């Protein structure tokens, strides 16, 4: 068995085993099944639930009241997908060892670029991605940090960030933060360490990553491209905004020629990303100015 049925199910074993690279794929693994997944619920927005039934239980105010709502809420995927160019006609030179040692390799780049597009993706070919999203959220809190000019890397920006989002977003459950390593090195390697920047392990016995800010643990890995202009952050509630539609099977369809001794290698699971709301994150900013 070669490019057939042998380094296949361990590929998905890796692919769940690499859920483990998570610049923010800790998100709500919606396990999709058919396709046009489409609930038409009302949001978890605005309530305030029942008067538990008697006479006129707040019968003057209000009713329904805000949104609410009915978004509605349709989802599917992008049939997300991978492929492994190598030399395959000469693969029968009796090794079977080499090749799983040649394996793993590409689940890495697979999931990494997957998360890259998952935070930097246009809803197009790949689904949606944070920095597009937070950009099209108009979330450039312009510009409370100032684009490498003046290293104002405290938390006041993050403070009114949290207190902008605190309607919708909750308080510190979980509420998260994906910065730049430059922003890291601006908010770690300092005395500030506010509430926490150091160390954000610190105990540990809880889940997340390097760094904690104000209770929010911190993520880096820089898909803002560097210096001055993007967000430098991703201050978002890790609950009230975003789930992860994955559908079902990745499959390692290792087909044949495909010539030049480089024969057909293909991997493929429909996954996606959606939320239920308006914004998760106001961040940066720190932009062109």
Interface of this chain with a copy of itself, residues 50 to 79, rule: CB under 8 A: 50-55, 57, 78-79
> End-to-end alpha-carbon separation of the chain, Å?
58
Name, in order, each residue with C-beta under 8 angstroms of 269's C-beta and a sequence gap of 6 or more. Answer: 15, 79, 80, 81, 246, 247, 248, 249, 250, 251
Q: 154 burial class (0-12, 13-18, 19+ CB within 10 angstroms)?
A: middle
Residue 184 as a binder of a copy of itself (CB under 8 A): the answer is: yes
Residue 47 as a binder of a copy of itself (CB under 8 A): the answer is: yes
| Residue that has been written with the tokens 């949290």 in this structure | 162
**Of 6-14, 96-104, 133-141, 252-260: span binding a copy of itself (CB under 8 A):** 96-104
Helix (DSSP H) and strand (DSSP E) numbers for the chain: 6, 12
Q: 37 burial class (0-12, 13-18, 19+ CB within 10 angstroms)?
A: middle
* Beta carbon nearer to a copy of itself, 137 or 240: 240
Q: Which of residues 233-272 bind a copy of itself (CB under 8 A)?
A: 243, 261-262, 266-267, 269
CB 226 within 8 A of CB 257: no
**DSSP letter, residue 108:** H
Residue 37 as a binder of a copy of itself (CB under 8 A): the answer is: yes
* Beta carbon nearer to a copy of itself, 82 or 231: 82
DSSP per residue over 214-228, as a string?
TTEEEE----S-SSS
Residue 195 as a binder of a copy of itself (CB under 8 A): the answer is: yes
Number of residues that bind a copy of itself (CB under 8 A): 96
Which one of residues 4, 59, 60, 93 is an interface residue with a copy of itself (CB under 8 A)?
A: 93
Name the minimum Å distance from CB 1 to a copy of itself.
17
* Beta carbon nearer to a copy of itself, 117 or 131: 117
**Of 104-112, 142-150, 229-237, 281-289: span binding a copy of itself (CB under 8 A):** 104-112
Residue 136 as a binder of a copy of itself (CB under 8 A): the answer is: no
**Of 4-12, 124-132, 141-149, 250-258: span binding a copy of itself (CB under 8 A):** 124-132
CB 127 within 8 A of CB 244: no
d(CA 274, CA 73): 9
Name the minimum Å distance from CB 269 to a copy of itself.
7
Q: For residue 257, what are its two tokens?
A: 């020629």
**Of 6-14, 22-30, 134-142, 281-289: span binding a copy of itself (CB under 8 A):** 22-30
Which one of residues 66, 98, 151, 152 is an interface residue with a copy of itself (CB under 8 A)?
A: 98
């Amino acid at each position: 068995s070669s490019e057939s049925y042998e380094t296949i199910f361990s590929q998905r074993i890796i692919r769940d085993l690499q859920k483990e690279l998570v610049v923010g794929a800790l998100f709500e693994e919606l396990p999709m099944s058919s396709k046009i997944l489409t609930m038409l619920v009302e949001p978890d927005a605005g309530k305030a639930t029942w008067v538990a039934a008697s006479t006129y239980g707040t019968d003057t105010t209000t009713g329904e009241e805000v949104k609410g709502a009915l978004k509605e809420i349709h989802f599917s995927t992008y049939k997300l997908a991978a492929k492994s160019f190598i030399t395959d006609e000469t693969e029968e030179d009796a090794i079977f060892s080499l090749l799983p040692l040649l394996r793993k390799r590409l689940i890495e780049a697979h999931a990494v670029s997957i998360e890259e597009a998952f935070m930097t993706g246009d809803g197009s070919g790949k689904p949606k991605g944070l920095l597009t999203l937070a950009s099209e959220d108009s979330a450039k809190v312009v510009t409370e940090a100032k684009a490498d000019g003046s290293v104002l890397v405290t938390a006041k920006t993050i403070s009114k960030l949290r207190r902008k989002l605190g309607r919708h977003g909750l308080k510190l459950s979980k509420l998260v933060l994906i910065v730049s390593m430059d922003a890291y090195y601006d908010l770690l390697e300092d005395e500030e360490w506010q509430d926490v920047a150091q160390v954000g392990n610190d105990s540990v016995k809880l889940q997340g990553q390097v760094g904690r800010i104000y209770g929010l643990p911190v993520v880096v890995s820089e898909y803002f491209p560097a210096k001055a202009n993007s967000a430098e952050f991703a201050v978002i509630v890790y609950k009230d905004n975003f789930v992860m539609p994955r559908q079902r099977a990745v499959t390692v369809e290792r087909e044949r020629q495909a010539g030049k001794q480089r024969d057909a290698y293909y991997v493929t699971q429909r996954v996606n990303l959606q939320r239920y709301f308006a914004n998760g994150v106001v961040s940066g900013t720190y932009a062109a100015s």
